[PDB]
């Protein structure tokens, strides 16, 4: 019904963007870890939202109904 992979756009507090190519079944903790590493901040200092809802570590794009080029927002925790 859908592809195996998805591109997600992560928008940070300063409006900058990093895009991620993610398998639909990957736990989104992996995206949180990579994003925090690129920003040089502790992962625990950030919260990641999709459609205004907190993304859990074990949430996957498939579970959340994410689609190509959907936005994840990053706010300070």
């Amino acid at each position: 019904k859908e592809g195996e992979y998805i591109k997600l756009k992560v928008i940070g507090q300063d409006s900058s963007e990093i895009h991620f190519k993610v398998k639909m079944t990957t736990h989104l903790k992996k995206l949180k870890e990579s994003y925090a590493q690129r920003q040089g901040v502790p992962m625990n200092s950030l919260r990641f939202l999709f459609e205004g809802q907190r993304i859990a570590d074990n949430h996957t794009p498939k579970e959340l109904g994410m689609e190509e080029e959907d936005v994840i927002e990053v706010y300070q925790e």
């Binding site: 963007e17 990093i18 991620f20 190519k21 993610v22 992996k30 990579s34 690129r38």
Partner: peptide
């Protein structure tokens, strides 16, 4: 610059 990261 566009930034695309491949996640495993």
């Amino acid at each position: 610059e566009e930034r695309i990261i491949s996640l495993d």
